[PDB]
Amino acid sequence: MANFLTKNFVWILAAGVGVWFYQKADNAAKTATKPIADFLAELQFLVNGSNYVKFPNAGFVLTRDALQDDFIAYDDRIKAWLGTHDRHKDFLAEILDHERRVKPVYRKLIGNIIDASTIRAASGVEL
């Protein structure tokens, strides 16, 4: 009774921790649960009509690359493309960046440390 109650509390708490970690792993990507038969049937029919090589393979590559928000919205619209939804999806892509921060700030400290400065060079020697 006492041992069973003590083991139940420790084991159930351990199972809750595994469920939280398993939930975070599944929730990392967008929830794949779909509740409807309209878009799934039409999109599959449109996939065979377009004759694209591997609709499942193209969807997996596009969803991860173009982001889940852009993929889910574009996937909802099975076919066609009109208005701002079409224009945004047509001219969509990833992103990079460049800016001054730690490198330039560290170099400025070296210049400030070398004030009024001392001469350092190389080229001479026995060679």
List of residues contacting other proteins (CB under 8 A) = 46, 48-53, 79-82, 86, 90
Asked if 58 and 52 count as a contact pair (C-beta separation under 8 A), the reply is yes
We find the least distance from the C-beta atom of residue 53 to other proteins, in angstroms, to be 7
- 11 vs 81, beta carbon nearer other proteins: 81
We find the least distance from the C-beta atom of residue 80 to other proteins, in angstroms, to be 5
We find the least distance from the C-beta atom of residue 82 to other proteins, in angstroms, to be 7
